[PDB]
Structures are given as C-alpha cells and as structure tokens.
Design a protein around this ligand. Structure first.
Ligand SMILES: [Mg+2]
Ligand SMILES: [Mg+2]
Ligand SMILES: [Mg+2]
Ligand SMILES: [Mg+2]
Ligand SMILES: [Mg+2]
Ligand SMILES: [Mg+2]
Ligand SMILES: [Mg+2]
Ligand SMILES: [Mg+2]
Ligand SMILES: [Mg+2]
Ligand SMILES: [Mg+2]
Ligand SMILES: [Mg+2]
Ligand SMILES: [Mg+2]
Ligand SMILES: [Mg+2]
Ligand SMILES: [Mg+2]
Ligand SMILES: [Mg+2]
Ligand SMILES: [Mg+2]
Ligand SMILES: [Mg+2]
Ligand SMILES: [Mg+2]
Ligand SMILES: [Mg+2]
Ligand SMILES: [Mg+2]
Ligand SMILES: [Mg+2]
Ligand SMILES: [Mg+2]
Lengths: 203, 121, 52, 153, 51, 123
RNA sequence: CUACACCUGAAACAAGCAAGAUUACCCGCUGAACUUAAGCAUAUCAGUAAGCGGAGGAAAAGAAACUAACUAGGAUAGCCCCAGUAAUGGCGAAUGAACAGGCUAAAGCUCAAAGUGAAAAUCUGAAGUGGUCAACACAACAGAAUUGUAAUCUAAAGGGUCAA
RNA sequence: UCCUAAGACAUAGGUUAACUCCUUGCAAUACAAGAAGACAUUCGUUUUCGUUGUCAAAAGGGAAUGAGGUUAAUAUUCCUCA
C-alpha cells in the first residue's frame, strides 16, 4: 500500500529528500499565520492512523508553537521566598509542545472537537503541528458510530482536560505499571486518595 | 492584467441580499408593526390649579405622555384621539418619571370645551 | 517529650481537616447493594446469578 | 506572493534527483496520443452503471443467465495502482508531475523499475482527473487491452 | 446640580417614591408586624450613590 | 357589566376580538379620566375589571394567531424558533436515539449470530 | 492569449455550531508563605492556599509494552489487608507507595496498516412522497471522496481451502 | 448631543498554560477592509475616485432671539409682540 511507503519515507527524515521537503515546508509555514486552517493534510498516511478521513466533517489546522523552556513570569526575576523557590531560567513546562499546539487550535476553534494531531516539522525557534478536528454540528460525524462518541457533551475540549494522546503522555499515562501507580486517576486524586483519613463507625 | 494603480484592492463581488429561509419568530412572520398606539401615547389629563389655569387662559391642555413618545407623535395622536388641531407640543420629564405634555390647540378649538367633553370640568 | 514511651509517629502534621472520610452511608449502602442484587435476580430470572 | 515565491525557491534552490525526475514530460504529441488511448479506456460514469445494473437485472430476472465479459478498465488511484504495480499486473503506469505533496508519488518510479513496469510522467492531475471522472488523480494504469489496442501498448 | 443623565433622573425618582411613609391603612392588616417603614431616608443625614 | 368567559371569546373571530380590544382600551382611558376628575367606586372597580379583560382578549388573539402560524408550518422542520421545541440547550444539542443505538455492521452480525440466551442450571 | 479544468485564497448569502453562568464533587495547568525542624537555608507545611483553563451527572480510569518467578495470576474503580512495612530525609525534623491475599463490581469493543478493482460497493444535503409530521422511511437533483468513503481485519488474530 | 486635545479602546497581527499583555492619527508590528455618482434605481447594471475604526471638552471650537408680561412654585422655554 502507498501508505507503508510513505511511513518509511517519514522514518527516513535525514535523507536529503526529506530534509529538503522539510526546509521547504517549514519555510511555507513560517510564511502563514500562527494558526491557520489547512485545506489538505500535509501528511495523509499519519493523519489516517489518528482517524482523519476525507469526508465532510473533518478539518485540519496548522499551528506553530514557540520552541523553548518556561521562564518564570515573575517581574524583574524577583521572587520573594526561600532559595529553592527563587528560580527563573532553567524551568521546563509540565505539558509537552504538541499538547500546546492542540490547545491553541482548540481555543481558536472552540466549536470543533480536537481528535488528534501530528508533527509537520520544526525549525530553530518553532515546531509546527497539524490538528485533526471533527465538527460535531455535522451530521456525518453524528451518524458515524465510530466518531459519534466525541459528539456528546462529556467529551468537550479534551485537549484542555489532557484527554488527547499528548495529554495522556504529559500525564505519564503511557506507562501502566508500578512506576505509574502514583499517576493513575489524576495524581492529585491518587494523592487525595491515599491522604484520606478514614474513620469508620466501628473501631 | 494592466494596472494603473500601485496597490491591490479587493475585486467587487456580487453581494446578495439577506434572505431568511424560515421566519425567525411568530411576530416576524406575522409582520408585526411595533408602532405605539394612539391611546398609549396620550395617557392622563392634569387637574392642578396650574393645568386648569392653562386650560382656561392659555388654550392649553396638560397630559401625561408615554415616556418614549416624541413631540410629533403627541401632536398626531392627540388629533386622532380628540378631533382637535394642536398648535404646539412641549415636553417635560418629571423626576417622578413621567412625561408632561403641554399642548396648545389652534384658534380653531377651545381647550375648555375638550375639557368639558372629557369630564375634566 | 517526657517519658519512656515509644517515639510518637506524627499523624495530623498536614491539614487533615480537608481530608477526613465518614462512614454513615455504609448503613444504607449495604442495603442498596442487597436490593440491587435482588433486582438483578428478578430481571435475570431463569438464569444464574454469578457467571461461570 | 506565497504562490509565486514557492515557484521561485523551487527554481533558484538545489532540487534533488527524485523531485527533478518529475520534470520529464511527454512532448505535446506523445502526451496527446496517450490521452486519446487512455480516454478510450475510461471507467463508467453513474448513468452507465444504472443502465447496466437495471438491464442485467432484467435479463437475469426475466429470461435466463447470459454469458458476461470481464470488463476492460482504466486503473486509477494511489493505493490501487501501487498494489497493481507490486503484482506485476500493471501494463502501463502514468504519473502526474503536478502532485502535492510529492512524497505520495515519489516511491512510484523506483518501484516500477524493480517490478520492470514502464512508467511515464505526464503534465496534469486534472487531466488524469478527466480521464478518471474525478477532480484530480495521482496516477493511472492499464491492465488489459483489447486486441485492437495491443499495437499502441 | 442642574445637569443630569436620564439614568440619574430615573434613579432619583425611584428613591423619591420609595421614600414615602407606610400608608396608614396598612397597619390594620391581620398578618402584618409593620408599624412603620424602616427604610425611610433623609437627604441630609444619608447620601445616595449617583456619579 | 359582566365577567368575561374564555371559551366565549374563543368562539368569536379575530376581527371581533380586535374590535372589542379597541373598545376596551377606550373604556380604560375614559375610566382613568374618571379617577382623575371625580369618580365613584363603580368606576374604580370598572378599572381593574377592564384591565384584566383586555389582558384576556389579547391572550385569546394570540392563541389563535399562534395556532394559525403553527398550522402553516405544521409538517415542516425549519419552523420559526418560537415554535421549535424549547427544553434545554443541552437537550437539543444532543444525539438522537437513532444515533444513540445506531450500530456498526460487524456489531449487527455478532448480535445475530451470538447474542444472549435464556439458560437455567439445575441442582 | 482565450474558453475550460484543477490547486490556493476571498466576499456576500442559506442552514447549523461556539462564546457567558454554575461550585460541593471531577480534569488539565500554575503555585507560596505562615507553620515544623525548638536557630536556618535542604527539608517541613506540600502539589497544600490563592490564580488560570475545561467539564459532567458523576469525572477520571480501563481490555496490559501488568504482575510474578509459583503447581502462577490477569482491564479500570472503590473497601480490607499488606503498613506505618520497602524505600525517601542536614538518615535530622519528618516523608512513605505497591505486588500477593479477603471483598464490592463486573464487559468488553472501534480504527491505521497487501486485497472492491467484476467496476464508490461509502458519507452529507436535499425540492419532495408516505408518516406517530420537530424526531421515522424512501427521494428527482447537488456536493464530499482515489493525496480515499463502506465491506471484510485489529494479534484473543487473520487470509486461502473444506465444512457439521 | 457634533468637532478635535492631552489621551484611550476595538479590528487586524503577535505574545501567554491561560488570564493577561504588545501595537494603532504623523493611524498601525495591520492591510484583498473604502467612498461617491448615475442610470438601475433592487439586484443588477454601470461609472468614477480609493489602503484600513471608534471614544475622550456641560470653561477649548461650535448655524440662528430679543424686549415686555405672567405663576404660590417654570421661563432667552409659557403669553404678547417683534
Ligand atoms: Mg475537505
Ligand atoms: Mg521563551
Ligand atoms: Mg513553551
Ligand atoms: Mg477515555
Ligand atoms: Mg451514592
Ligand atoms: Mg452634578
Ligand atoms: Mg453632609
Ligand atoms: Mg457621608
Ligand atoms: Mg474553492
Ligand atoms: Mg466557560
Ligand atoms: Mg498552621
Ligand atoms: Mg519556636
Ligand atoms: Mg512530599
Ligand atoms: Mg449540566
Ligand atoms: Mg494504618
Ligand atoms: Mg485481589
Ligand atoms: Mg423536506
Ligand atoms: Mg458529485
Ligand atoms: Mg490623539
Ligand atoms: Mg495608543
Ligand atoms: Mg451657537
Ligand atoms: Mg419664541
């Protein structure tokens, strides 16, 4: 199938072909707005694996997010508190870039529902992603038993609640196992859970 | 093609009228006209020594008017209602929150009379 | 800290006021479970309760 | 500005072999002939399928079974054509030069070489569209011909 | 002063009306405890908010 | 001088109800003019009576007009929002039963060829 | 060069979608000091308050890239235990889970990826016709779609050949 | 009420986890954004010229009224006259 061929291409990214296609792309994207709507999916074999389909009710958007780390937003680098807390430069943000992309898309296009996303390439100061959204107001998405689930009230803005593959990763959820125990069911909930002081009417 | 100008401008596009497909609400579809009714325009007559002195002496009637009404609206409404020719209308907003209208009839009519028919004597 | 007694083990060191669990529902809960089970039987009537 | 600049970069930069090999296109004569042949091999439009389904249903439902012929079709589509290239079944491969993104078509040429299938670069995706009753197609292929056309193949 | 918004006029009018005393006949109802209007206000001793 | 009965009103035409409306309103104004000049308790009561009356008349007129527009639009979806169901934003925004239960092919197949059976064990 | 096709972008219009509210519980972020170490920086208070963004009736989680090495077990969640244990800590103050085992509850499923190529078999809208007429069934005509819709398939399989 | 000022805020674009934040009269860190005419008089047709917003002054700018008389309380406002 053409798709396996594509896959291996993209797993070949160093080859002069790939590098070339990329520098070129990246250039295009740098030319377009920060968040713009794509007409097609630059990477169809990938978008498929995430459940894009060409049928009305599917949309793709490109976002470029800033590469970097999180400088702590306090003014003049001033932080009042013990030496462990004063810190600014070397901090790294909890959620991953991909997720950022998802959420910026999500907010620019709040009507739609983010299904997924994939890397379209990155330059020195950026990273570009395409985000796959389904339109819940479109009967095609509604009547399709496969994606109709994302149409119901409970699935609203899943990028922002970290229910996206990116979110799940940021939550360490890509690990099931005893190293993951603390993370399961929201490490705040795991924590509240243990922290609970239980008092039973008998004893 | 050939460009006289240095700058681009957006081509003129055919912009259709806004055509509803379904009527948005009952009223709309029923083509309801929101004009204030004549009797809601003129509300109440005024009895105070002032009002009366104005009716006897100045050929004037004093009435409370619907707040959102205009002067011309008052002139018309007062004619349609009372069969009189209104020479002038003047407007007050009381602090109490009402519109006083000082109305002067033409030489044709006599305020005292309209007073008499209305039950204002 | 006075006598020979065994070194205490702190409990209430954090703010536990937010973190206490109360067991009064237990009473009714047991009951609910009962009725659930029973209403299962009735709706499953010809068939057995627990699967093989 | 974009559209133009894309073109300009593509011209002023160093384009690699694979991308450049899509610059080789049949001179108008060759192309046109090819389009004539392929056009003769065009696949069914809707009306034609309705006619034939209705007609055959009436023939089989009323009189009796009739001997039917294995139809001679034009091949269209990336996955299908790729398979048909893997399976040696494709007699001719015709690729559009105009595809974006190029990745989609880039494995075709060396694929065809390894399978010893003849492959051509044509200019238009729209052209291939018209041949196939779509807006645009990446590639078109031939499997069967009928005696008359063997000469052309 | 002289110059006022509508809003103002209307608000002032409101508070002016609300500043009446309990009507002498309300005190005769069967279910009421109200001898007087507890909410009355005097311009000199207490000021409204209009700006 | 009598109370107004609803059914009686629903008996008449639109014209009728309208004419009556206008009359009633004129009545009111005359009456308030009563209050203002000099008036008898009869006139005071008259007021409340006529007010309520006018309300009633209007109510009827709208009932009729409404049932009429609803009539025209009966049968079509894309009625005016006035008439469309109002329950909750969440209610309308939700999926259908058709869609709730709606099932993928493989599923209909398993449901046919496997499904659930009535059994009994004996002891 | 024209007509025309396709890719890309734009305006107006039709039909639908989002914008705020809610606080107890839920999700994703952000994030301190008082306090305790009888001082105090690590630490503790503590991922705690405050702050921000999202929901729901619950949320989240879930069909193993799990345990365990035994004559093994087997999604997720809660209860009981394991336990104040292993470990973490100016090894100071003080932090601190899980497996096995007893229960409650029980449920398993959909995609991408060689295979319609004897033929897009697919999806959406629809003047309309029947209807329980807002909710259903067909539907002339239109779009979406081979830079791929639907049938098979999802590793517990599966394709091919038989077949009760 | 209109106008512009010191100023200010949208829109567009960009920044932020997000909230927020940065630009804009010499108008933009923006820009396929406008106005007019005529026939038509709807569209449409047609023509012409064109880069793109708003708020902020009851002492600033700012189309034109005066005298006499009247009320218990208004009046360069009502009345009379000009
Ligand atoms: Mg599309
Ligand atoms: Mg930075
Ligand atoms: Mg960052
Ligand atoms: Mg989930
Ligand atoms: Mg409960
Ligand atoms: Mg003042
Ligand atoms: Mg004072
Ligand atoms: Mg004071
Ligand atoms: Mg287009
Ligand atoms: Mg909200
Ligand atoms: Mg304390
Ligand atoms: Mg101390
Ligand atoms: Mg800790
Ligand atoms: Mg709710
Ligand atoms: Mg314990
Ligand atoms: Mg167990
Ligand atoms: Mg219809
Ligand atoms: Mg079509
Ligand atoms: Mg200025
Ligand atoms: Mg400024
Ligand atoms: Mg002047
Ligand atoms: Mg004058």
């Amino acid at each position: 199938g053409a798709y396996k061929y594509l896959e291996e291409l993209w797993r070949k990214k160093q080859s002069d072909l790939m590098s070339f296609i990329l520098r070129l792309r990246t250039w295009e994207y740098r030319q377009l707005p920060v968040i713009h709507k794509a007409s097609r999916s630059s990477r169809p074999d990938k978008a498929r694996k995430l459940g894009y389909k060409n049928k009305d009710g599917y949309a793709i958007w490109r976002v470029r997010v800033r590469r970097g780390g999180r400088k702590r937003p306090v003014s003049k680098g001033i932080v009042y508190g013990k030496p462990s807390s004063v810190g600014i430069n070397q901090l790294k943000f909890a959620r991953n870039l991909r997720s950022c992309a998802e959420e910026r898309v999500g907010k620019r296009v709040p009507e739609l529902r983010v299904l997924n996303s994939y890397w379209v390439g990155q330059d020195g100061t950026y990273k570009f992603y395409e985000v796959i959204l389904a339109d819940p107001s479109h009967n095609a998405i509604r009547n399709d038993p496969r994606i109709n689930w994302i149409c119901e009230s409970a699935h609203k803005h899943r990028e922002l609640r970290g229910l996206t593959s990116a979110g799940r990763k940021g939550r360490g959820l890509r690990v099931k196992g005893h190293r993951a125990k603390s993370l399961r069911t929201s490490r705040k909930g795991n924590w509240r859970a243990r922290q609970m002081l239980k008092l039973r009417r008998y004893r | 093609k050939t460009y006289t100008g240095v700058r681009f401008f957006r081509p003129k596009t055919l912009q259709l009228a806004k055509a509803p497909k379904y009527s948005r609400t009952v009223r709309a579809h029923l083509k309801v006209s929101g004009h204030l009714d004549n009797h809601s325009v003129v509300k109440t007559p005024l009895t105070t020594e002032k009002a009366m002195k104005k009716m006897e002496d100045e050929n004037t009637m004093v009435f409370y008017v619907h707040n959102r009404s205009t002067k011309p609206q008052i002139k018309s409404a007062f004619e349609k209602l009372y069969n009189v020719k209104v020479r002038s209308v003047n407007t007050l907003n009381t602090i109490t929150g009402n519109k006083k209208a000082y109305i002067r009839l033409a030489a044709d009519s006599d305020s005292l009379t309209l007073a008499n028919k209305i039950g204002l004597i | 800290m006075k006598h020979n007694n065994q070194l205490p083990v702190a409990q209430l060191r954090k703010h536990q006021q937010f973190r206490i669990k109360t067991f009064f529902n237990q009473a009714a809960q047991k009951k609910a479970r009962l009725h659930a089970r029973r209403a299962q039987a009735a709706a499953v009537f010809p068939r057995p309760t627990e699967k093989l | 500005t974009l559209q133009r600049q894309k073109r300009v970069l593509l011209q002023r930069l160093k384009v690699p072999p694979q991308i450049h090999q899509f610059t080789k296109t049949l001179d108008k004569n060759q192309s046109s002939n090819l389009f004539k042949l392929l056009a003769s091999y065009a696949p069914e439009k809707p009306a034609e399928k309705k006619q034939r389904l209705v007609a055959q249903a009436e023939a089989k439902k009323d009189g009796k079974q009739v001997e039917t012929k294995k139809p001679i079709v034009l091949k269209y589509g990336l996955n299908h054509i790729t398979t048909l290239i893997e399976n040696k079944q494709a007699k001719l491969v015709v690729i559009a030069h105009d595809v974006d993104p190029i990745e989609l078509v880039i494995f075709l040429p060396q694929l065809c070489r390894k399978n010893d299938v003849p492959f051509a670069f044509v200019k238009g995706k729209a052209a291939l569209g018209k041949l196939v009753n779509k807006k645009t197609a990446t590639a078109v292929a031939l499997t069967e011909v009928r005696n008359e056309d063997k000469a052309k193949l | 002063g002289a110059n006022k918004t509508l809003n103002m006029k209307k608000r002032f009018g409101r508070k002016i009306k609300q500043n009446r005393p309990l009507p002498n006949w309300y005190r005769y109802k069967s279910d009421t405890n109200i001898r007087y209007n507890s909410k009355r206000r005097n311009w000199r001793r207490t000021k409204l908010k209009i700006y | 001088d009598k109370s107004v009965r609803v059914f009686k009103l629903r008996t008449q035409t639109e014209e009728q109800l309208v004419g009556e409306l206008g009359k009633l309103q004129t009545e009111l104004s005359q009456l308030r003019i009563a209050k203002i000049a000099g008036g008898t308790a009869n006139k005071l009561g008259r007021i409340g009576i006529v007010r309520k009356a006018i309300a009633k008349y209007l109510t009827i007129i709208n009932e009729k007009r409404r049932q009429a527009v609803k009539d025209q639009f009966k049968g079509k979806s894309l009625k005016p929002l006035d008439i469309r169901v109002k329950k909750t934003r969440a209610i309308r925004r939700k999926l259908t039963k058709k869609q709730r239960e709606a099932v993928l092919v493989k599923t209909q197949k398993k449901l046919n060829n496997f499904g659930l059976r009535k059994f009994a064990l004996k002891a």
